[PDB]
């Protein structure tokens, strides 16, 4: 009970929003490099992100272990996107984590965040360089705090409303 | 190394601000059980090498003037630094006996440029309210104490010397959610266990 369960078919479905391309392409490879069902979206007319998310919120993740999403900007409210995956709002994701990665320029338990700001950026450049190398053998926090170390060698916060540790088995 | 340096003379300070009785003009309830909430934390961090100092029913000017004077100290022989708040709070703001000060104003005193004595050192902050900002961590959260506090030390005197803070805080988040949620915002750069 000290880590999140991983006896699941799919790892999870990864969503990538890309308003505007190196970071996206690099995030794609490195997240599929964990075993993610990755889907990329560009030129997202702000009406998209809403319906785009809610769809996935009404999908089935019973045979999925988790769920990740990534935003890339430079107009859509933060909370109005995440609330689709509330406690009751998406019952297929309970006792399952929700991971939102951001870079621009009961309920609410088991959520994680990471917002960065500005070739491509550092944060991104830094992250993949870990997930490729130490991706499948670290707890999530052990990873992000390593990224903050890497970017500081040249800062993005990290909201953790999680309940157990997070490595990446099957 | 992939973790914070603990080989220091002393650990660090541990300012506790126990706000219980606020003024009437604030129209703010008397936060009860907070004496227990403080004593629990004080006893806990005491047993972790924190030189614990407990402040009580302070004004906003006090809480401001206090931390500033503590930021301007010599923290060189100290590994880290902690500060725990107990009061009423709202949207990124926290009550004093007299008024209301923005939380980001209190912590600002320690921002690496204005507290060089704590640079590359973790500067912690615990909130229970009813390399700019690097090395910062924030953990915002009856008869017995609160859940959070009681559950924290419950895990902290038990595992605190042998677990990383996230391992500690993530653990805390489970037992509070077990009863029925706190948000741990981290800007750290290295893992942090509470021993040598």
UniProtKB/Swiss-Prot annotation, chain B:
First-level EC class: hydrolase
Site description Involved in allosteric regulation, residues in chain: 140
Single GO BP term: defense response to bacterium
Keyword terms: Acetylation, Allosteric enzyme, Apoptosis, Cytoplasm, Hydrolase, Nucleus, Phosphoprotein, Protease, RNA-binding, Secreted, Thiol protease, Ubl conjugation, Zymogen
GO cellular component, one term: nucleoplasm
EC number in record: 3.4.22.60
Residues forming the catalytic site: 88, 130
One MF term in the entry's GO annotations: peptidase activity
Catalytic reactions on record: Strict requirement for an Asp residue at position P1 and has a preferred cleavage sequence of Asp-Glu-Val-Asp-|-
Region described as Loop L1: 20-31
Post-translational modification (record): Cleavage by different proteases, such as granzyme B (GZMB), caspase-1 (CASP1), caspase-8 (CASP8), caspase-9 (CASP9) or caspase-10 (CASP10) generate the two active subunits. Its involvement in different programmed cell death processes is probably specified by the protease that activates CASP7. Cleaved and activated by initiator caspases (CASP8, CASP9 and/or CASP10), leading to execution phase of apoptosis. Cleavage and maturation by GZMB regulates granzyme-mediated programmed cell death. Cleaved and activated by CASP1 in response to bacterial infection.
Subcellular location: Cytoplasm, Cytosol; Nucleus; Secreted, Extracellular space
Keyword Hydrolase listed: yes
Highest rank taxon of the organism: Eukaryota
Family assignment from sequence similarity: Belongs to the peptidase C14A family.
Annotated domain remarks: The exosite polybasic region mediates non-specific RNA-binding, acting as a bridge for RNA-binding target proteins, such as PARP1. The exosite is also required for interaction with non-RNA-binding proteins, such as Hsp90 co-chaperone PTGES3.
Stated role: Thiol protease involved in different programmed cell death processes, such as apoptosis, pyroptosis or granzyme-mediated programmed cell death, by proteolytically cleaving target proteins. Has a marked preference for Asp-Glu-Val-Asp (DEVD) consensus sequences, with some plasticity for alternate non-canonical sequences. Its involvement in the different programmed cell death processes is probably determined by upstream proteases that activate CASP7.
Subunit structure: Heterotetramer that consists of two anti-parallel arranged heterodimers, each one formed by a 20 kDa (p20) and a 11 kDa (p11) subunit. Interacts with XIAP (via its second BIR domain); inhibiting CASP7 activity. Interacts with BIRC6/bruce. Interacts with ATXN3 (short isoform 1). Interacts with HSPA5.
Protein's recorded name: Caspase-7
Organism: Homo sapiens
Lineage, highest ranks first: Eukaryota, Metazoa, Chordata, Craniata, Vertebrata
Name of the gene encoding the protein in the UniProt record: CASP7
């Amino acid at each position: 009970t000290y880590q999140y369960n991983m006896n699941f078919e799919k790892l999870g479905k990864c969503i990538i929003i890309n308003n505007k391309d190196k970071d996206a392409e690099a995030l794609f490879k490195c997240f599929r490099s964990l075993g993610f069902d990755v889907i990329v979206y560009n030129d997202c007319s702000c009406a998209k992100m809403q319906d785009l998310l809610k769809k996935a919120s009404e999908e089935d993740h019973t045979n999925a272990a988790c769920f990740a999403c990534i935003l890339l900007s430079h107009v859509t409210p933060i909370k109005d996107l995440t609330a689709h995956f509330r406690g009751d709002r998406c019952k297929t994701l309970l006792e399952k984590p929700k991971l939102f990665f951001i870079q621009a320029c009961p309920v609410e338990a088991d959520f994680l965040f990471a917002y960065s700001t500005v070739r491509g950026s550092w944060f991104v450049q830094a992250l993949c360089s870990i997930l490729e190398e130490h991706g499948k053998d670290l707890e999530i926090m052990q990873i992000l705090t390593r990224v903050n170390d890497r970017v500081a060698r040249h800062i993005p916060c990290v909201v953790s409303m999680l309940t157990k540790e997070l490595y990446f088995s099957q």
